Amino acid sequence: MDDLLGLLRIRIKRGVNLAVRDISSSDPYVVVKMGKQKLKTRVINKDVNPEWNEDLTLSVTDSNLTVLLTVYDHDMFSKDDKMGDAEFEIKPYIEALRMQLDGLPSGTIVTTVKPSRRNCLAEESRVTWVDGKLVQDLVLRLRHVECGEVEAQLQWIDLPGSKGL
């Protein structure tokens, strides 16, 4: 709390053309990890295009952390099957939050992160001021799997009585 910058709300929106790990479908869920914290979405049954629309909220004490993301196919009576992984840096978003831009029309773009051979972006990721909030939109190409993307949006939670940014 003396350590707390704020909380990172990771809105896991949807999975797109995810890998088949049963016979003709999968039962996917997302897990994220940032340092010691691990959080998961619910399982969506028999859908390789799952609409999770679920928030995973992590505490942040460091500007330079990496979020790891993975998708699994839930099997009730066997080991869950792999559906791929990705990761992303929070530094750009946190740096943007620290630019202290006071509105700032709706839609202005503060930072753009380009897809690269090393990162997991399927398309450029924009940090934008939207509806009175700074957010980052992400489309993650999944690694170690034959197909699949996960769409997410980062939002920030400030807690009064904490270190802050």
Added chain:
Amino acid sequence: MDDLLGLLRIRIKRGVNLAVRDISSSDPYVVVKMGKQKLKTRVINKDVNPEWNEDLTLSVTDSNLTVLLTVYDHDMFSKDDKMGDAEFEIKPYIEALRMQLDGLPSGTIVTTVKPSRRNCLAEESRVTWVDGKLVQDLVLRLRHVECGEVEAQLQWIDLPGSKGL
């Protein structure tokens, strides 16, 4: 932190038929108070049916507190008029968070709170165990105003390092 159970997420979903405090509309926002904490939603312009869909995140160190919700009309260059208020107890939700509900099927209704002459519920409020999460849905009829309801949902955020439930 030594006292902190965790964080209560109050999602302020929407206002329904809120009072007109300008000429033909209002610019509503919600102020939520609990203990020493005071949080605010953004203003929605010229809409008496505002879709805030906004999360307000409160620290919980005392399970016995009341949450007060007050709606106001934003007037940029003048005073902000009251548009009614409601309150609710978080004790039932916290009580439920402390039960053994891992292993309950999704969709299990743990607690139902009925509207009464004393409380602000417009209809029965259910505390539901769903998709591995406990949620409370609330429809609050605003007091001290000619019309208006606010819809909200409680969810819980764990904080590693906290006292916990």
